RNA sequence: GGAAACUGGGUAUAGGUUGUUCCCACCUGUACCACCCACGUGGUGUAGUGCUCCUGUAUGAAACACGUACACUUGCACGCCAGUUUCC
RNA sequence: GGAAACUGGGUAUAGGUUGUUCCCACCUGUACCACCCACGUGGUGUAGUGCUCCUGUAUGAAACACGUACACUUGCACGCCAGUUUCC
């Protein structure tokens, strides 16, 4: 019922600008403080900015002052983060969070959006190629075999891997992406299955890389002859 | 100027039923305007405590927070496996708001051997002129493993990268992939590609291998 | 076995702007179901703290509560004149509910000697056949006084009673009345009726007295 | 807005019985637990009994086991306490208290009635006799004099003392009553006044003992012996 | 390679043993050795489904009770896998 | 009995007046010592009232701003207690 949805993130050249939006439902933003909080990949939460109800007062973290501008459109139930003069340091996931009701949860942030990734880089967007990680050539274990998809050479993050259009979930491991020396990311997704399920089950991994609108389905099988 | 929240330990491990306590010391007073949050990897944080010691509705009572001066502790009285997360304190006594660095908590559990699979490069990728050899280590504990690539028994250096899943919040096991990258030319100079895994669940190292071109 | 809440101190003296802390110990675990109440003489209790550390709505932020094991403390960080009252903890972890014995908070002030007045029985009451001798100690501090009656130099036991006013809101003093009751028949057997007052404002005990019939 | 009003209090013979009632306004009792808490003159709070919502469960202090019965009539928004086998020990002011809403104040009792006095005693209602504490013919203490009224041998509590129909308040102390071996209460009321006002001012104390509708005014003068 | 029927933790060992050549399976006993309970003279493929049973957690104006949601644990059935036997 | 005017923390001490009695209703200087401030070369009977001024507190969907309620501290006026002085 109450929720927040950030949008507007993406990949930007250094010195560029971007406008994040936070669309509220199940409540009215004018009766709450609204905060922006960011998280650089692999680091903690960093508070960025906030705007107060009834007066519009806004407060800014030290490291984004004069470049970021928080504001709120109470007639669209949306908050905004105008980010200008984007610098390399500003790569993070950006959350908007609602400060709860004073009487009910003090100053805690009681609902958070799922966040939108902002990537500052002069590097160029690139879609992945998907390669089969074929099940065991010698049928390694007479128990459960593994197979997977190698999702290689993409930028920026992120990329989603699913199996059988979501109908296979148990035993899936999608690994964290790894940055290769080439500047491109690469990950694989793997799953274990009964060895007898081969030939009697089709396994298709669905790779979706939204930063380049790449959708690839790869059917994965044991190799032939 | 800015109020600093110092959190300790920055990481910790304990097993189910243990009492964990995370502390967080505010440089200069914040009175009682401290919140604690649980963030599971890849997810938004969830509020746990507000006003330093009040239990947010819906949160299990095994969580509690206490204040003593400028010191704040989050306590989990009886650790459940789903409490693997990173935990953050936060002062909201004055702007700018401040977070502590976080405490990453992972679950102790009984040693579990990895099951090793090796995967040769696909024909499609070799079209492009590159070979990726993947070694999979599945569902093991503890996290420390060592994976060595041998190409005709020549221990390989500097041409592979690893990746490890987040700790399974259910059974607290890890999985790990090692990826070896060679030019198609360099790949085709050799026949025996092997992955050798040492882990303490193993009474002696496991090797999985294949021969290039052998089906 | 009922949970006992042991509260301490049972009274304390403090001045405005002071920080007081009242402690309260659960005989057995109560986790966090502890409340604190403020009561002024003649009035119902008022809720102050719940769930051991949560500030009830409408209550000033100078009140707070904390928990350490089975110890619960109410803290008033800076005493306001309206905070002199009695305070009670309460466990509601399981029935029967239990209250602490209470803690009375009083205004500290400079020592003030009692002023002793003695009052003989009136003619009207002597008509009724009963005689009451009243001794007054007025506007003194601290509350501790000891008043013993001597009637022709015999210390009296068990036939007089005391009563003490609440602490005065303006000047923070106590007053005390002591009444000695005899049958008029027994009254007419002696001549010198005396009230002897020892108080720490008095560098030696004060004696006020009268002679029956000579005013 | 929200309040509770106890009634039904009074004087009861030992071994007697009494039904207190607690009438609610500003909220409906069927959604709250309701508690009875009592306080003997000059002592702490003692929890007595409670009733649960939605289940009607009842709980009792051990010291009232088998004698008290708590109950609730939600079509009057009223709670009841039936007391049987009353002993002098049960003399106290009786409060009913609402356990507040769980999400808002835990298990704290957030509203309380003003409480109704219950007096268990085999003594009989009797108005006081009032005697003057005459300012000393020679010397009570000195400086400014003291005078007063002894309000002796009344039952039950309470008693109201005022001086000159309320127009003299400064320097007045009305002492807490003391229960005598006869079972009647006795208290004194005193005033300190300028020594020079004694020749020019008459001082009259107004005693009102409502349980017997007795009003006694007593003029207090220096004695003339 | 199809279709049926039977069986279900290892480990070791005495073994036994498609009645036939040691013995693959089958098949147990025994000692073990684990995992899991609600802890016995106990149970034993399993991240599917329904139901059942054991609790915990959270919440519904809600301390118990009652609802809902979520987890947890008994067991059963069906599915699935692993064999096995059988026939095509 | 009116009417009026004036004065106001102790404590010491030096004066003034007052009848004369050596202290008085007092009052002025000074020292000492308190209570109170917004803290000075400052202020001083006072649980009342109004205005004011200083902050605080609680609360309004509320960290600031804004509203409201409640307290607090100046200063003033009236009332009140204590006195004098005066006049009918």
Numbering used by the authors:
A (entry chain A), D (entry chain H): 4 to 228
B (entry chain B), C (entry chain L): 1 to 215
What did the article's authors report about this structure?
Enteroviruses contain conserved RNA structures at the extreme 5′ end of their genomes that recruit essential proteins 3CD and PCBP2 to promote genome replication. Previously, the phylogenetic and biochemical probing analyses have proposed that the domain I (called replication-linked RNA, REPLR hereafter) folds into a cloverleaf-like RNA secondary structure with a base-stem, sA, and three stem-loops, sB, sC and sD. For this, we prepared two crystallization constructs for each REPLR by replacing the wild-type sB or sD loop with a Fab BL3–6 binding tag, 5′ GAAACAC 3′, which enabled Fab−RNA complex formation for each crystallization construct and allowed subsequent crystallization of the complex.
Here, we crystallized and determined four additional structures from the CVB3, rhinovirus B14 (RVB14), and rhinovirus C15 (RVC15) REPLRs using a Fab-assisted RNA crystallography approach. Consistent with the CVB3–DLmut and CVB3–BLmut, the two RVC15 REPLR structures, RVC15–DLmut and RVC15–BLmut, were very similar (RMSD = 0.972 Å for the superposition of the common cores without sB and sD loops). Intriguingly, with the formation of U43•G76 and U46•G76 wobble pairs, the RVB14 and RVC15 REPLR crystal structures showed a single-nucleotide bulge with flipped-out A44 and A47, respectively. Notably, such an arrangement forms 2 bp between the 4WJ and the bulge in all these structures, suggesting that a single-nucleotide sD bulge is sufficient for the 3C binding, which is consistent with our 3C binding studies with the CVB3 REPLR. For example, RVB14 is expected to form an sD triloop (UAU), and RVC15 and PV1 show sC pentaloops (CACGU) compared to a typical sD tetraloop (UNCG type, N = A, U, G or C) and sC triloop (NCA, N = A, U, G or C) found in other enteroviral REPLRs. Interestingly, with U41 being flipped out in the RVC15 REPLR, our CVB3, RVB14 and RVC15 REPLR crystal structures all essentially contain an sC triloop. Such arrangement not only maintains the four base-paired sC helix in all enteroviral REPLRs but also precisely positions the conserved A within this sC loop (A40, A35 and A38 in the CVB3, RVB14 and RVC15 REPLRs, respectively) to dock into the sD Py–Py helix. While the length of the sB helix is longer for CVB3 (9 base pairs) and RVC15 (8 bp) compared to that for RVB14 (7 base pairs), which may have implications in PCBP2 binding (discussed later), the sB loops seem more dynamic with the highest crystallographic B-factors. Interestingly, the lowest-energy models for RVB14 and RVC15 superimpose well with their corresponding crystal structures.
